[PDB]
């Protein structure tokens, strides 16, 4: 369910499609697999305070949620 996934849980639509395809990424051609990739870095900006790497992209890493 796309509606309740957002109401009872802070799951955005994009994250849902990711979790949706998550189980079928291998079934899809490699053309689509390379598209489903998120890898960047987030720093809390002092000279060297923090360096966060965002690579999970399904859990509370890229699209946080209430359930997590």
């Amino acid at each position: 369910c796309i509606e309740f996934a957002f109401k009872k849980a802070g799951i955005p639509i994009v994250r849902n499609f990711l979790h949706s395809t998550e189980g079928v990424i291998y079934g899809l051609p490699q053309r689509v697999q390379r598209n489903l990739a998120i890898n960047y870095t987030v720093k809390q900006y002092k000279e060297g305070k923090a360096v966060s790497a965002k690579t999970i992209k399904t859990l509370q890493e890229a699209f946080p949620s209430k359930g997590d």
Binding site: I2, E3, F6, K7, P12, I13, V14, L18, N35, L36, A37, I38, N39, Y40, T41, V42, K43, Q44, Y45, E47, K54, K57, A62, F63, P64
Partner: protein
């Protein structure tokens, strides 16, 4: 004039021009790929939400028209250095717009050079930034759009500063203005011309908000990424050009010093042979 020193410095400039010339080739190669990706992904769902909202007459009647007092600036710059003057242009404009009035902008930067360059001038103003982007794609652009959404609640407006890739050799700075989540929902509830019953309005309002935000972010990255390879290639050309001019100038001084060297040594031999 110590030919050994001049010949060494000439060798250094020769290598710089060589590596500088090679980087231009890679700059052109990557520019082709980015343009190919840009031309295929451009104008993707851009202005769609803006268009339908305009088509909503009732929305315009109940539209809340106010001036946002607090806004959030998210400049977009390249992370790799020696990419050209595109980064300097963006950090320069945001500096002007920010130095003028302080405490009215969050200034969440994007790109190593963008954040690093704005760290010292605006300390305690920028708190987080995004850098080291492996690749540009809509899922990632949504993650960035989602982050900006979380940070946009504190400000009444959001705008993105990035380079517009209008031509392979012309990149003009362009900035879009996006309203925050709170203002979007209160505006979206007025939507009545375009029915939303398959997903109920409470869900559709939040979903299409992502599309509205991610669309602009995804489009901005492509324009800036294409401008990066474009400005980088032009920079290497000018750099390799200047490297060659200086290398040729020293060559003349090297030959001039060569003649003086033979002259000096030859006179010494004649002076000793005279006696």
């Amino acid at each position: 004039a110590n030919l050994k020193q001049l010949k060494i410095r000439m060798k250094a400039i020769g290598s710089i021009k060589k590596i500088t010339k090679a980087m231009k080739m890679v700059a052109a190669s990557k520019m082709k790929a980015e343009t190919s990706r840009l031309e295929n992904g451009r104008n993707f769902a851009v202005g769609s939400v803006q268009k339908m909202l305009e088509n909503e007459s009732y929305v315009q009647k109940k539209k809340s028209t106010t001036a946002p007092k607090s806004t959030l600036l998210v400049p977009i710059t390249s992370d790799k250095g020696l990419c050209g003057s595109v980064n300097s242009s963006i950090v320069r404009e945001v500096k002007r717009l920010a130095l003028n009035n302080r405490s009215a902008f969050g200034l969440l930067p994007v790109g190593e050079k963008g954040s690093s360059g704005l760290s010292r001038p605006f300390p305690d103003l920028l708190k987080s930034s995004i850098v080291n982007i492996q690749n540009v794609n809509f899922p990632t652009a949504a993650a960035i759009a989602h982050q900006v959404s979380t940070q946009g609640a504190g400000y009444d407006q959001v705008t993105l500063i990035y380079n517009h890739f209008k031509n392979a050799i012309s990149y003009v700075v362009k900035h879009q203005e996006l309203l925050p989540r709170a203002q979007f929902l209160n505006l979206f509830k007025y939507v009545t011309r375009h029915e939303a019953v398959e997903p109920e309005l409470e869900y559709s309002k939040n979903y299409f908000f992502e599309l509205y935000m991610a669309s602009s972010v995804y489009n901005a990255l492509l324009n800036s990424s294409a401008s990066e390879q474009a400005s980088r290639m032009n920079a290497m050309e000018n750099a390799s050009k200047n490297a060659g001019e200086i290398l040729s100038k020293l060559t003349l001084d090297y030959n001039k010093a060569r003649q003086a060297k033979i002259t000096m040594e030859l006179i010494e031999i004649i002076s000793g042979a005279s006696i």
